[PDB]
Structures are given as structure tokens and as C-alpha cells.
Tab-separated table of C-alpha atoms (C1' of nucleotides) and ligand atoms in Angstrom:
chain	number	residue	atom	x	y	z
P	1	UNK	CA	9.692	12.702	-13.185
P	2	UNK	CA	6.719	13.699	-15.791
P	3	UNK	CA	6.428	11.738	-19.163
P	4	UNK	CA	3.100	10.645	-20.823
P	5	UNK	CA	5.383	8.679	-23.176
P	6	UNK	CA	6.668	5.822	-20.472
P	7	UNK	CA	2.934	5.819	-19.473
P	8	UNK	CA	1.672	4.718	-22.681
P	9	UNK	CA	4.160	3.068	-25.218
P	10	UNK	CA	3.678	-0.571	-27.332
P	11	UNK	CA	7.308	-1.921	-25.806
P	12	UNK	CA	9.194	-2.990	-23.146
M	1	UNK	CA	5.944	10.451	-32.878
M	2	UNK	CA	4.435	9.602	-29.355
M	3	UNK	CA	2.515	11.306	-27.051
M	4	UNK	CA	3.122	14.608	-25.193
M	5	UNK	CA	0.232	15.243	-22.383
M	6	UNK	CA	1.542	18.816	-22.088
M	7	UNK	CA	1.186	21.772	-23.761
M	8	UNK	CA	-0.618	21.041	-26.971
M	9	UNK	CA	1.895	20.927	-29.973
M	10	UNK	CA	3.245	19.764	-32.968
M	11	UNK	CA	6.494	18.084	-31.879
M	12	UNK	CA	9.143	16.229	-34.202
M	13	UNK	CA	11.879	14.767	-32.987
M	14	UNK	CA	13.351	11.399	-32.261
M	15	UNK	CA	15.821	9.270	-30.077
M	16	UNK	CA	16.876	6.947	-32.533
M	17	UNK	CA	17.183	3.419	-30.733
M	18	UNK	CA	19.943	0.818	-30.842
M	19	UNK	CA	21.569	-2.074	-28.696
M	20	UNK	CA	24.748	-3.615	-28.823
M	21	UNK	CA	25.253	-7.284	-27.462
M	22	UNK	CA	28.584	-6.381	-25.146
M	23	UNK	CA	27.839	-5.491	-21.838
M	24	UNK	CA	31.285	-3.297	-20.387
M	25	UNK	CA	31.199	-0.839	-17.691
M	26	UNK	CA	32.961	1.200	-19.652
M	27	UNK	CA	30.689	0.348	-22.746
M	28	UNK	CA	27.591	1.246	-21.016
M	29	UNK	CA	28.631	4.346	-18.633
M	30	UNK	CA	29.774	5.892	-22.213
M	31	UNK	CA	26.689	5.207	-23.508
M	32	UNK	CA	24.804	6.804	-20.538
M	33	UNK	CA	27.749	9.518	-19.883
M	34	UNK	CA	28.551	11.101	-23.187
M	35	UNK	CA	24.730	12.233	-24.271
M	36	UNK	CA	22.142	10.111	-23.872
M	37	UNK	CA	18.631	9.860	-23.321
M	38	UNK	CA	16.432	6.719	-23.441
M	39	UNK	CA	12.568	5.600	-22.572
M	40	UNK	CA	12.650	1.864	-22.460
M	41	UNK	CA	15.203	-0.888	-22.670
M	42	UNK	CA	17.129	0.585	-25.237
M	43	UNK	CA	19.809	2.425	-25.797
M	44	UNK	CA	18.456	5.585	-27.940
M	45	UNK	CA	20.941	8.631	-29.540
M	46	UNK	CA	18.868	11.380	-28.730
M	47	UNK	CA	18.371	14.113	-31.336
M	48	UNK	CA	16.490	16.713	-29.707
M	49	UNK	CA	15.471	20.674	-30.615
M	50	UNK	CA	12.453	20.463	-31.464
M	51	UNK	CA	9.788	20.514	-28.466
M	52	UNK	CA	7.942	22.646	-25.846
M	53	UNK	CA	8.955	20.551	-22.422
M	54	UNK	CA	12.778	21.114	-21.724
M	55	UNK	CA	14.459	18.673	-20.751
M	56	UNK	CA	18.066	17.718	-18.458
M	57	UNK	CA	19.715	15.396	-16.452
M	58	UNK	CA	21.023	16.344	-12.970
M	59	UNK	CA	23.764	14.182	-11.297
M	60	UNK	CA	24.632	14.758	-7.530
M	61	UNK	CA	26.598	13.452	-4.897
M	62	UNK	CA	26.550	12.108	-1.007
M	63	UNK	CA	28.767	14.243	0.523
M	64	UNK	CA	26.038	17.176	1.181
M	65	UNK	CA	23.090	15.659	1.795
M	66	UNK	CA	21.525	16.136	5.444
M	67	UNK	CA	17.933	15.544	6.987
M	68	UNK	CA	15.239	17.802	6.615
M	69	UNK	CA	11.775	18.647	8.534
M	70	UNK	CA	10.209	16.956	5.483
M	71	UNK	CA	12.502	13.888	5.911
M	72	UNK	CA	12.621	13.766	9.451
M	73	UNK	CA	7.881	13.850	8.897
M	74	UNK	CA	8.225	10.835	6.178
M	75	UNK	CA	10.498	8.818	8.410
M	76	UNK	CA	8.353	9.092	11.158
M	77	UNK	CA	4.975	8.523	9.545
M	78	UNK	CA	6.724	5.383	8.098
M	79	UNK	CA	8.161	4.286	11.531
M	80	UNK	CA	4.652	4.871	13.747
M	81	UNK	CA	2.853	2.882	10.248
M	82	UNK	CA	5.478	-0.346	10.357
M	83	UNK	CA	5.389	0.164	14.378
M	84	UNK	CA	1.859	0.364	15.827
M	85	UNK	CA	0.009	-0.669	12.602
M	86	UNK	CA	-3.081	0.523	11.338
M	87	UNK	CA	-6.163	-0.501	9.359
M	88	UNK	CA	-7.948	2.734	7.523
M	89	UNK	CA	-11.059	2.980	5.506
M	90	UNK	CA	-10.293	6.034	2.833
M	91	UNK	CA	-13.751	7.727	2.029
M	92	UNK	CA	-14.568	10.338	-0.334
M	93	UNK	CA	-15.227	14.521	0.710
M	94	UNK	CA	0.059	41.430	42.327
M	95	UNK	CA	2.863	43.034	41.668
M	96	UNK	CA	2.936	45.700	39.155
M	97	UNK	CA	5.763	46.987	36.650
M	98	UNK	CA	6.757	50.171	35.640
M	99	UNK	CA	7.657	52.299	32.168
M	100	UNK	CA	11.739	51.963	32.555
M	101	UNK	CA	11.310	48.794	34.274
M	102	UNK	CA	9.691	47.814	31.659
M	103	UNK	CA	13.049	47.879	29.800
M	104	UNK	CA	15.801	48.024	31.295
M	105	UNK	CA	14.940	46.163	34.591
M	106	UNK	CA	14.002	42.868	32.775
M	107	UNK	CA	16.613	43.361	30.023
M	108	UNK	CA	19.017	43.397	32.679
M	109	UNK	CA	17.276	40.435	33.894
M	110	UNK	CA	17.369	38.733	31.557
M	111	UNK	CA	21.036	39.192	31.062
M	112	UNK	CA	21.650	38.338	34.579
M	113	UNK	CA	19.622	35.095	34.209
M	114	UNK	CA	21.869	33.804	31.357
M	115	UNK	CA	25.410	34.959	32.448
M	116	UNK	CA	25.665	34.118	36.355
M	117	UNK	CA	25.655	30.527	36.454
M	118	UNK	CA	28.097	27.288	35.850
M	119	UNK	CA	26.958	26.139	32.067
M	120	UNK	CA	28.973	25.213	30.020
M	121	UNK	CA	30.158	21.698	27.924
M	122	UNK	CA	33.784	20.934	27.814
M	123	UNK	CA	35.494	17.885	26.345
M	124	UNK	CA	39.008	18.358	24.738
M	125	UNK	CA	40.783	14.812	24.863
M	126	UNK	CA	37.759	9.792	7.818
M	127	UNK	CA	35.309	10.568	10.392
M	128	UNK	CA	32.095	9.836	10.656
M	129	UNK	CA	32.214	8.213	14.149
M	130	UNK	CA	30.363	11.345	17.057
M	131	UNK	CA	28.647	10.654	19.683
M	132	UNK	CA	29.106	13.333	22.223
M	133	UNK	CA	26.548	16.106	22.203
M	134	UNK	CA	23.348	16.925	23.383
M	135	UNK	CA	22.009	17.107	19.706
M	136	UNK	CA	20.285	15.149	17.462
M	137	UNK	CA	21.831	12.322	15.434
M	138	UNK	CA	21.726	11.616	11.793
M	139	UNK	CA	19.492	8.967	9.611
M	140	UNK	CA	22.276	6.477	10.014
M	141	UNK	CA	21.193	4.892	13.474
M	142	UNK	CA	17.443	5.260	12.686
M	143	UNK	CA	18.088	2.646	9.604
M	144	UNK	CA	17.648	-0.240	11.106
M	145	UNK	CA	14.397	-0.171	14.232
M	146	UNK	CA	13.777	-1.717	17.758
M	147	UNK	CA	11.105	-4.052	18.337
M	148	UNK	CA	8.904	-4.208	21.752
M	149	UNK	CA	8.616	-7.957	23.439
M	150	UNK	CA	6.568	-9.343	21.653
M	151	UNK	CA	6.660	-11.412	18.269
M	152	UNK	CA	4.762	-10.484	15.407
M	153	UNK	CA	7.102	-8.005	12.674
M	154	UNK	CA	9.632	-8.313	9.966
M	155	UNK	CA	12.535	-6.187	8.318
M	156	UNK	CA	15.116	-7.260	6.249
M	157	UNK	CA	17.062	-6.616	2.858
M	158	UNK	CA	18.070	-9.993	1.684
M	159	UNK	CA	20.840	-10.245	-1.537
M	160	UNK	CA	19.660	-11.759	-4.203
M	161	UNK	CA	21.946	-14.999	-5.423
M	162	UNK	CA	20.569	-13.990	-9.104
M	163	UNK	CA	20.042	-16.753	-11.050
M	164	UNK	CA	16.798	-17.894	-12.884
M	165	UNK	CA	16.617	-21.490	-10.803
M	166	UNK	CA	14.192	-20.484	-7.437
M	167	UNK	CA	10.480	-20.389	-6.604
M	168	UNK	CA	10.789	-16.814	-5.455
M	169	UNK	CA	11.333	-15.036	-8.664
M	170	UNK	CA	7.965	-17.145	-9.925
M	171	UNK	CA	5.998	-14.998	-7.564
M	172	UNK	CA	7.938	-11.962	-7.902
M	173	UNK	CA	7.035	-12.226	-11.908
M	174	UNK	CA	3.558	-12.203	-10.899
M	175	UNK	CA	3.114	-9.809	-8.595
M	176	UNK	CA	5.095	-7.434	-10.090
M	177	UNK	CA	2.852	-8.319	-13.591
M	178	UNK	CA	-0.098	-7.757	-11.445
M	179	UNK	CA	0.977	-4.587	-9.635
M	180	UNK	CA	2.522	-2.784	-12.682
M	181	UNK	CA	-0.719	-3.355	-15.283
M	182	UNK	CA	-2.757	-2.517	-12.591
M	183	UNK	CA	-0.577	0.725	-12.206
M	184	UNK	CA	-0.679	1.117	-15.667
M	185	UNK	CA	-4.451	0.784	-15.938
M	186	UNK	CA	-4.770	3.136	-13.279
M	187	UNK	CA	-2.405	6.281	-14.219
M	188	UNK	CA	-3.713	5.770	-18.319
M	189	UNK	CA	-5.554	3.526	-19.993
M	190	UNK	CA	-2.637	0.952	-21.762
M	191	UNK	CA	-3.853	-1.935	-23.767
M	192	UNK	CA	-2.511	-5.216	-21.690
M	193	UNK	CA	-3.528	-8.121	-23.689
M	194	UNK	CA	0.208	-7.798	-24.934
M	195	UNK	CA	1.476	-10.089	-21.876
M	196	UNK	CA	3.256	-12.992	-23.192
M	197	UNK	CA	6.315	-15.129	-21.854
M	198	UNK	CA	8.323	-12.741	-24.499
M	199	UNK	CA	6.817	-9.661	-23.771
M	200	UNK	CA	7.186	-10.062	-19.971
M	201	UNK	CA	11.076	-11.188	-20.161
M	202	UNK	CA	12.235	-8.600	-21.997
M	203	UNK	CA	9.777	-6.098	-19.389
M	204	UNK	CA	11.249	-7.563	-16.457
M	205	UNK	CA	13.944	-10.469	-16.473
M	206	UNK	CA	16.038	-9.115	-19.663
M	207	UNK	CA	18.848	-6.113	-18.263
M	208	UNK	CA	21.806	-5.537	-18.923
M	209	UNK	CA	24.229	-7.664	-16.784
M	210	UNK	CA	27.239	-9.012	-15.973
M	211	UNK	CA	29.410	-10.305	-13.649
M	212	UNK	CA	31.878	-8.984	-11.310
M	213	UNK	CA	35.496	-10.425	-10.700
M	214	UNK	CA	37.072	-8.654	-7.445
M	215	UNK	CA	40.817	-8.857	-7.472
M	216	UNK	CA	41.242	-8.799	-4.051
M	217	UNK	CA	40.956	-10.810	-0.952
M	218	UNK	CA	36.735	-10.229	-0.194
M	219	UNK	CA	34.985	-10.275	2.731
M	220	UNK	CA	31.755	-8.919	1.416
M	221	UNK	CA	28.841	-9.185	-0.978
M	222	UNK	CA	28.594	-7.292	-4.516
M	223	UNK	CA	25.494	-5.572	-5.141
M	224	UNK	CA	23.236	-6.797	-7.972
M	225	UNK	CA	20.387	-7.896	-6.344
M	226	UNK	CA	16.798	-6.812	-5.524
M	227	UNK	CA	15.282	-4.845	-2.654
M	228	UNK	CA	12.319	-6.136	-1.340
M	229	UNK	CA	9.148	-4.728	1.192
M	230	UNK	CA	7.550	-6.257	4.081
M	231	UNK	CA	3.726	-5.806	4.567
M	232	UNK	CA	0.998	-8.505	5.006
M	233	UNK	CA	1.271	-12.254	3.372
M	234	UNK	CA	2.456	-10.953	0.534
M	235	UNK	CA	5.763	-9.916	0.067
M	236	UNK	CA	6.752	-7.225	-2.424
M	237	UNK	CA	10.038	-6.696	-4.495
M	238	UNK	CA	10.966	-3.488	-6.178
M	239	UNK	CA	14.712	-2.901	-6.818
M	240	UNK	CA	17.105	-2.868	-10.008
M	241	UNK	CA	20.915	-2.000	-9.875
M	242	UNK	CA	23.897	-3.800	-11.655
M	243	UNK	CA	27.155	-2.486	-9.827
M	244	UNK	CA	30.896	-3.349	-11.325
M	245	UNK	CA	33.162	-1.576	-9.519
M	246	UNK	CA	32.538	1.783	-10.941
M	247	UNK	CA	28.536	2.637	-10.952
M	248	UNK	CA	25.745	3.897	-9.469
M	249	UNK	CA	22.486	3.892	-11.110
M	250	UNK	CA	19.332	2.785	-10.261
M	251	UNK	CA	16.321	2.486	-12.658
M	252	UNK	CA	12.697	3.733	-11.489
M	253	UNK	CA	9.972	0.985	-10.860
M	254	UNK	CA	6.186	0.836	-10.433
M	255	UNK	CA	3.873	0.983	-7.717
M	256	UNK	CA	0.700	0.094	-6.915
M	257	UNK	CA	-1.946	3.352	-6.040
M	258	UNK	CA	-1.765	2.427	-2.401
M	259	UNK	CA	1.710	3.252	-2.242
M	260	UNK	CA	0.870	7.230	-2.966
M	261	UNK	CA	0.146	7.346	0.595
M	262	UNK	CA	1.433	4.805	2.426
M	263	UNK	CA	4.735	4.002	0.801
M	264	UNK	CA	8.378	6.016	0.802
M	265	UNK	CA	9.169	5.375	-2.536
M	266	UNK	CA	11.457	8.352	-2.634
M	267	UNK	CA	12.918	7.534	0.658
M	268	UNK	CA	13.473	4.242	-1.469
M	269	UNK	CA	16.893	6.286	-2.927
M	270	UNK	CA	17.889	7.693	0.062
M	271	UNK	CA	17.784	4.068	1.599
M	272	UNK	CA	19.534	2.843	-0.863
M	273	UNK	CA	22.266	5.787	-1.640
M	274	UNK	CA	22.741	4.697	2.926
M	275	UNK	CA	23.415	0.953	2.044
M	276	UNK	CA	25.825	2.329	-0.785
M	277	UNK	CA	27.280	4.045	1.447
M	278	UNK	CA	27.700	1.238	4.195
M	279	UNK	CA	29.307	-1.240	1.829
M	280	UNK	CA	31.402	1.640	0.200
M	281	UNK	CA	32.974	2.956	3.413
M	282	UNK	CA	35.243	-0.085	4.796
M	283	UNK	CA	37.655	0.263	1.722
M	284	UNK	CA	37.160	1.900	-1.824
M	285	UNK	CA	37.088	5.345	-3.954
M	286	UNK	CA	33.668	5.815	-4.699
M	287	UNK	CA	31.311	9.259	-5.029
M	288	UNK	CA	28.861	8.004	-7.544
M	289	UNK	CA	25.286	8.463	-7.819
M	290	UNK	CA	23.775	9.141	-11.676
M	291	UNK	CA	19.585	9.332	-11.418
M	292	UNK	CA	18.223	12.427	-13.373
M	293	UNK	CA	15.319	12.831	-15.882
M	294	UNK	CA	13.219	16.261	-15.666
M	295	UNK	CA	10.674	16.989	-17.972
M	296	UNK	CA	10.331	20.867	-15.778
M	297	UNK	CA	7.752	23.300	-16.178
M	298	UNK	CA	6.625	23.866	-12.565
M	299	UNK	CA	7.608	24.238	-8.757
M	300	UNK	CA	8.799	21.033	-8.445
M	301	UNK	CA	12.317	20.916	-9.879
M	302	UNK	CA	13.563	22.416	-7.354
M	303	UNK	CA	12.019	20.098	-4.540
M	304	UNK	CA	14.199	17.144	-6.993
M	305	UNK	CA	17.152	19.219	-6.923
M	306	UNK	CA	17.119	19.643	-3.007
M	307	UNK	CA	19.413	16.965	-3.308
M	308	UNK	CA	22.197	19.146	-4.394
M	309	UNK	CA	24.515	20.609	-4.018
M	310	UNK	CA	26.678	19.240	-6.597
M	311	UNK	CA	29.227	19.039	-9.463
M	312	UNK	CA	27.646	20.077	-12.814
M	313	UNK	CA	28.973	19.507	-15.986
M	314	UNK	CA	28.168	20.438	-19.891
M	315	UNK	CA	29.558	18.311	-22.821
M	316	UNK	CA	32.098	21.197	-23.292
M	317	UNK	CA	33.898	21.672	-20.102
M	318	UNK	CA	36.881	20.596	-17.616
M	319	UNK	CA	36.490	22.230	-14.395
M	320	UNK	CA	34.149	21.092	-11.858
M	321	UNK	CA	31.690	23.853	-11.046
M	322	UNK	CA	29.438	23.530	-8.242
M	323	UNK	CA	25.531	23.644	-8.864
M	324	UNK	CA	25.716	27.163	-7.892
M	325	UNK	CA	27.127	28.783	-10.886
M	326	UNK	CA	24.398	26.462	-13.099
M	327	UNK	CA	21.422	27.515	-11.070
M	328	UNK	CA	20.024	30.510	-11.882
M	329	UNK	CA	20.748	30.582	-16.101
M	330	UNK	CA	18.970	27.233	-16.488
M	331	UNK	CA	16.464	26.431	-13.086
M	332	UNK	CA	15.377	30.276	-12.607
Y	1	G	C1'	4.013	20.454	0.256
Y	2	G	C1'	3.798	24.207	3.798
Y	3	C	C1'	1.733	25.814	7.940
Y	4	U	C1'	-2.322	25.676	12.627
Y	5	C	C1'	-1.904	24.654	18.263
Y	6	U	C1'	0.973	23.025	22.576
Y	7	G	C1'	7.507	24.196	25.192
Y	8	U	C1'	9.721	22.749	33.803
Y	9	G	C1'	12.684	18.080	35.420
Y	10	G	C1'	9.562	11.590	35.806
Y	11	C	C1'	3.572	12.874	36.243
Y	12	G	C1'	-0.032	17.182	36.361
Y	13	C	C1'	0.944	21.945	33.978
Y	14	A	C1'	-2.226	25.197	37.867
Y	15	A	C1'	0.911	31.144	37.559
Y	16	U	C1'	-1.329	35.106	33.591
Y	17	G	C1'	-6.141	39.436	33.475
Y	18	G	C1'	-2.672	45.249	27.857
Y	19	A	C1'	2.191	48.247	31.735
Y	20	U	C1'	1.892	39.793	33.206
Y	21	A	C1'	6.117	34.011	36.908
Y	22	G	C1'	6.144	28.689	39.832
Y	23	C	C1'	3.999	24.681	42.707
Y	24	G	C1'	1.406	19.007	44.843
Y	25	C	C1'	4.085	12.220	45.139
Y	26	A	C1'	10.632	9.763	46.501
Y	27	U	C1'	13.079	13.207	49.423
Y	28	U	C1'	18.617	16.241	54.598
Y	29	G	C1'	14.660	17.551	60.469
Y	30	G	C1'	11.026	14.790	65.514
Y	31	A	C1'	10.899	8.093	66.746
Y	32	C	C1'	10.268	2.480	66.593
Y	33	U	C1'	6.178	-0.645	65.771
Y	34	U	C1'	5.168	-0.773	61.909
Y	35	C	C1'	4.666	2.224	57.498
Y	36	U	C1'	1.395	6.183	50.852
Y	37	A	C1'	-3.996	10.278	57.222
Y	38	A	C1'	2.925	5.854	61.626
Y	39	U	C1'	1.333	11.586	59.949
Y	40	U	C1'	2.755	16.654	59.260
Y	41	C	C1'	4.940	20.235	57.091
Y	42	A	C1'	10.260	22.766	56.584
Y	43	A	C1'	13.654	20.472	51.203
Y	44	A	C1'	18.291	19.375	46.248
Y	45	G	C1'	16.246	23.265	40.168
Y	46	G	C1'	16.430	27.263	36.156
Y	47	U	C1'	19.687	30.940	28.515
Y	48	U	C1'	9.789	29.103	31.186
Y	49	G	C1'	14.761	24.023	24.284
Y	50	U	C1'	19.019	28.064	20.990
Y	51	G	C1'	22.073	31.294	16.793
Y	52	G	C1'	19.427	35.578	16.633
Y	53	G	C1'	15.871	39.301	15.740
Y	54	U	C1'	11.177	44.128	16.958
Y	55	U	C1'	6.512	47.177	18.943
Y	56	C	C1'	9.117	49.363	25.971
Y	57	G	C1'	8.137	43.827	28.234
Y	58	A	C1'	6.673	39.902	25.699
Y	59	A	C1'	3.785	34.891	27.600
Y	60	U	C1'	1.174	36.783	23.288
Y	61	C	C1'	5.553	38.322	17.349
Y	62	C	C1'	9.366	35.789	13.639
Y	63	C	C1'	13.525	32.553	10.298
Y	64	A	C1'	15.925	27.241	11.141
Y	65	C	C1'	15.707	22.846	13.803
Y	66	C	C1'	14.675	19.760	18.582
Y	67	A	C1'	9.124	17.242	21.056
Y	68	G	C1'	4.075	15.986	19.851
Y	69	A	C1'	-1.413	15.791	16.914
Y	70	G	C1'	-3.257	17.406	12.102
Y	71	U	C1'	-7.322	18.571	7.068
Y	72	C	C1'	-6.526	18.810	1.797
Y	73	G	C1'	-2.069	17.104	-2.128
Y	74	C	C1'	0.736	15.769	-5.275
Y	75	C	C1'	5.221	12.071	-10.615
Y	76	A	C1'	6.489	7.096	-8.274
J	401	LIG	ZN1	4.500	19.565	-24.462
RNA sequence: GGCUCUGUGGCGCAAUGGAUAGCGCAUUGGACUUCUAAUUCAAAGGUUGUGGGUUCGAAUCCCACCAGAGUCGCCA
């Protein structure tokens, strides 16, 4: 997969 | 609104998150089944037209998959690696013929080469039990290796008795902290002074879970457990899969920048769709296997779906239609 | 990720050069103390891996795999 979102993101 | 590294744009649009505290398998398959799409450890209703990456997810069975060259290279590269080791350094950079002979003499030759002569195989006296051929077998047998005489190796895939009580996990927490900032760090740039005890529980140790009670008589072990990696002294653990007795779905996990040439973390699934396999086949009704998340502008889609083929389905629709009909309208 | 070069059967692959093809060590034949100069040569094998293709034949050309080595790459 491609996502720059999951990559960079304040949660978990 | 977060970040698209893509095509520059001004994109709205939102998955609007929520959780419920009732963990059902039929609870959570509707919630990934109906139409779904979630980043994180949340369940998010996704509202979505308004973007320039499409998106879809792409479901697929076991019943058509079969080795490749490309499978057959990986497998081997990982069985000479784990077999005869190896420590790299990565830096940066007479008789002559005639005009009708020609044909028809050695055409005819070659004719009477192949027909006059005694060759020929014959044998005439659920199934995936063969062994008579002189042809290659499939990935099943090449699962598990063969080790020379001496003693110095490891392979194994241990269950998991999961329960927060064990000195194991402690190290697992770590490593896994270590190797997924450092992946992080690596891929982009993430701020990581965020890592507390809560942060990290509800990254790693909180899932959604529960317990399976088997009406039956069981000889056999239910899978929600971790799969783990042998290498050096230190031992690595990267598998996440909760299985009542109608699922399949696994979630992705990280890896550290070594892995993107020595690892087989795609091999990973179709290790673990085999040991699937192996516990389903002895006695149950199960084709099952839901892992699909595309963000596809590019040649690669179709290397993902090489998988198929497989069922499709639409959220209007009640006929089973292979992948066939689907592909060219939406993957051409 | 595709493709580059190698294709007898245990080993070696010698045959090949624009009208191009098979062999050296165990071995069935001479003899008993002694034997890989106790010789030496005469011997058991065959769609040079298949389902097929094109210049006349391909060995030399090609799709897919079976056997092997490989730069640079990737969304894991
Ligand atoms: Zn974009």
C-alpha cells in the first residue's frame, strides 16, 4: 500500500 | 485534514471515527464488511468523494493461487540467506548438407527421433495428496527446511498463550518500540517524544479481542497469537490476527530498513494464508482471506492483484462475479 | 521488477567454423597373484528438459516453467 497519512499521524 | 504526499491538492473529506466497547464477530466483520475504511485503531465511517488518489479494497481467495518465477526467486534467496549465511557490507555507487536436406531430411529426422522409441508414463490404478510425476511440487513441502549435520540454526512458529503475565512480551514491547520509531524516523520525519506507557498500549497491546469457545471435541490450537523471526541474538516478533470461527484478516506491521532487502515480508501472507490453510483443512468450511487497501496510480496494482483471481463484489449486488468482469472498467 | 549467459546421464562438457553432432573413470571379453600403467582396448544411452512456434536447418531465434550466477529497484 501507499499512504503518507499512516506515515505521519499524532495517534495510535 | 491530513496529509496527501501525492498530487498536490486541495482535498476535503473525512472518515469520521468511532468505537464501540462490544467485541462480536459479527459486530466487527459488519463493521469491516458493509463500507468501511479506517487508518488507525478506530473504527472510522468513511465519507469519501472528494480527492485525487482513488481508492478500493480487493478481497481474494486460496483456491487459485499458484507459484510464480518471482516466488519461486524470493523463496530461494530466502532459503540460500537462512541456509549458508552471509555477512555483507552495503556501499554506495566433415560432412556437408544439402538445400532439400536441409529440410526435409532433418525434419524427417527429427520426427523419426521423437516417434520410434518406448516413452511413455502410465499409471491407472478433497485432494490435495500427488506425488507421482516427474514435475515439480508446490510451496507446501518447501515450508518447513532440512538442516545439514551440524548444530547451529533455528525455525519455529510458536502460539502465543496470550496473556499479559511473561517476560517475553517485555522485550517484544521494546523491540518492536525500537524497530517501529526507528522505521518511522526513517520513511518521514514523526515527532517520537509521544512514547508513554498510554501511548504505547493503545499502539501495540490494545486490539480488539476476544475469546473463542469451540463446541466440539478439539484436538487443536485456535489462532490468536503472534508470528515471530529467527535471526541473530535477538529475536523478532511481527504478527497480529484474532480468529473466531469465521475470519481472516491480518493487520500490516513495521519493519526495520534492513528488511527491504533481506526480509519476505510479503511472503509473510503467503506463509501465513499456508498455515491457514493447514489448520483449516482437517475439518471446517472456510475460504476467507480479507487484506485490501490501494491508494493506485501506477504499475503496481496489478503486481497486488496477481493474487486473484477472485469473487468481487459492490454494495449493490447478489451474484458472485469473478474478477474478470471487474477488471478492465475499474484497473485499466 | 524484468531480463543477460549457460541445457548429456554421476564428473568434465571437448563436437561446431553461415548450407553445423558425441566422447575419457565403475563396467558383459583374455587369467590368478594380487589389483586405479595386474594393463589394454572392444561396452549398457538419447523429444542435445516440453506445449508449441519462423528465416530452409537451427546450435545460434521466441512465449511459459524446470536447473544455476547476476547489476540497479522498489510500499512493508
Ligand atoms: Zn493526492
Amino acid at each position: 500500500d501507499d499512504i503518507a497519512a499512516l506515515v505521519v499521524d499524532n495517534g495510535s | 485534514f491530513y496529509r496527501c504526499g501525492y498530487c498536490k491538492n486541495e482535498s476535503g473529506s473525512r472518515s469520521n471515527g468511532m468505537w464501540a466497547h462490544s467485541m462480536t464477530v459479527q459486530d466487527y466483520q459488519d463493521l469491516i464488511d458493509r463500507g468501511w475504511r479506517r487508518s488507525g485503531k478506530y473504527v472510522y465511517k468513511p465519507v469519501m468523494n472528494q480527492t485525487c488518489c482513488p481508492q478500493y479494497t480487493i478481497r481474494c481467495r486460496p483456491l487459485q493461487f499458484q507459484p510464480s518465477k518471482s516466488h519461486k526467486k524470493v523463496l530461494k534467496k530466502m532459503l540460500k540467506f537462512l541456509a549458508k549465511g552471509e555477512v555483507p557490507k552495503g556501499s554506495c555507487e566433415p560432412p556437408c548438407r544439402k538445400a532439400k536436406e536441409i529440410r526435409k531430411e532433418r525434419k524427417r529426422l527429427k520426427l523419426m527421433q521423437q516417434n520410434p522409441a518406448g516413452e511413455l508414463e502410465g499409471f491407472q490404478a478433497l485432494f490435495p495428496p500427488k506425488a507421482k510425476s516427474n514435475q515439480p511440487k508446490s510451496l507446501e513441502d518447501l515450508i518447513f527446511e532440512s538442516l545439514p549435520e551440524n548444530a547451529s540454526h533455528k525455525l519455529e512458529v510458536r502460539l502465543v498463550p496470550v496473556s499479559f503475565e511473561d517476560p517475553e512480551f517485555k522485550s517484544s514491547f521494546s523491540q518492536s518500540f525500537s524497530l517501529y520509531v526507528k522505521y518511522q524516523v526513517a520513511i518521514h520525519q514523526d515527532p517520537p517524544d509521544e512514547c508513554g506507557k498510554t501511548e504505547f498500549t493503545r499502539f501495540l497491546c490494545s486490539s480488539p479481542l476476544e475469546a473463542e469457545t469451540p463446541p466440539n471435541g478439539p484436538d487443536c490450537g485456535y489462532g490468536s497469537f503472534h508470528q515471530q523471526y529467527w535471526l541473530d541474538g535477538k529475536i523478532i516478533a511481527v504478527g497480529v490476527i484474532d480468529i473466531l470461527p469465521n475470519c481472516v484478516s491480518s493487520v500490516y506491521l513495521y519493519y526495520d530498513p534492513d528488511y527491504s532487502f533481506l526480509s519476505l515480508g510479503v511472503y509473510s501472507a503467503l506463509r501465513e494464508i499456508a498455515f491457514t490453510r493447514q489448520l483449516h483443512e482437517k475439518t471446517s468450511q472456510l475460504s476467507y482471506y480479507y487484506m485490501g487497501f490501494y491508494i493506485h496510480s501506477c504499475p503496481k496494482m496489478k503486481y497486488k492483484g496477481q493474487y486473484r483471481p477472485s469473487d468481487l463484489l459492490c454494495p449493490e449486488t447478489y451474484v458472485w462475479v469473478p474478477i474478470e468482469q471487474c477488471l478492465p472498467s475499474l484497473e485499466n
